[PDB]
Amino acid sequence: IIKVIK
Amino acid sequence: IIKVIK
Amino acid sequence: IIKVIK
Amino acid sequence: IIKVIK
Amino acid sequence: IIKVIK
Amino acid sequence: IIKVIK
Amino acid sequence: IIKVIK
Amino acid sequence: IIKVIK
Amino acid sequence: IIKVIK
Amino acid sequence: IIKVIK
Amino acid sequence: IIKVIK
Amino acid sequence: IIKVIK
Amino acid sequence: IIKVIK
Amino acid sequence: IIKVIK
Amino acid sequence: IIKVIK
Amino acid sequence: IIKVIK
Amino acid sequence: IIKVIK
Amino acid sequence: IIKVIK
């Protein structure tokens, strides 16, 4: 599980 | 599971 | 599962 | 499952 | 399943 | 599990 | 588990 | 477990 | 367990 | 660009 | 760019 | 860029 | 850039 | 940049 | 930059 | 920069 | 910079 | 800089 916000 | 917002 | 918003 | 919005 | 909006 | 906000 | 905010 | 805020 | 704030 | 092999 | 092999 | 092998 | 092997 | 091997 | 091997 | 081996 | 081996 | 071996 990988979650990224930029 | 990969979730990305840019 | 891959979900991407740009 | 791949979902993409640009 | 592949869903794309540009 | 990896979660990143920049 | 890795969680990063910059 | 690694948690970082900068 | 590693927790860092800068 | 989306490329998938199963 | 999304590339997946299963 | 997202690349996944399972 | 996200690269995952399982 | 996120790179994971399991 | 996050790199993980398990 | 976070690097982890288990 | 965080580097961990277990 | 944090470096840990167990």
Residue numbers in the entry:
A (entry chain A), B (entry chain A), C (entry chain A), D (entry chain A), E (entry chain A), F (entry chain A), ...: 1 to 6
Lines quoted from the article behind this entry:
To obtain atomic-level insights into the architecture of PSMα1 and PSMα4 fibrils, we computationally identified their amyloidogenic spine segments, and determined their high-resolution structures by means of X-ray microcrystallography. Segments PSMα1-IIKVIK and PSMα4-IIKIIK, both of which are conserved within naturally occurring PSM truncations, adopt the canonical cross-β fibril architecture, wherein pairs of β-sheets tightly mate through a dry interface, forming a steric zipper. Both structures belong to the class 1 of steric zippers, indicating that parallel β-sheets mate face-to-face in the fibrils formed by the PSMα1-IIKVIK and PSMα4-IIKIIK segments. Proline substitutions in these spine regions abolished fibril formation of the full-length PSMα1 and PSMα4. Structural indicators of fibril stability of the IIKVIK and IIKIIK segments, i.e., buried surface area and shape complementarity between sheets, calculated from the crystal structures, resemble those of eukaryotic steric-zipper structures. Specifically, the steric-zipper segment PSMα1-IIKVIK showed a peak at 1621 cm−1 corresponding to rigid cross-β amyloid fibrils, in accordance with the crystal structure. For example, fibrillation of PSMα1 promotes biofilm stability by preventing disassembly by matrix-degrading enzymes and mechanical stress. While PSMα3 forms cross-α fibrils and enhances toxicity against human cells, PSMα1 and PSMα4 form cross-β fibrils which likely play a role in stabilizing the biofilm matrix. The highly stable steric zipper structures, forming the spines of the cross-β fibrils, putatively serve as the building block cementing the biofilm and creating the rigidity that can explain the resistance of amyloid-containing biofilms. The atomic structures of the PSMα1 and PSMα4 derivatives offer templates for the design of anti-biofilm compounds.
High expression of PSMαs, which are four peptides of about 20-residues in length, increases virulence potential of methicillin-resistant S. aureus (MRSA). Amyloid aggregation plays roles in PSM activities in S. aureus. In the present study, we investigated the structure-function relationships of PSMαs and their short truncations.
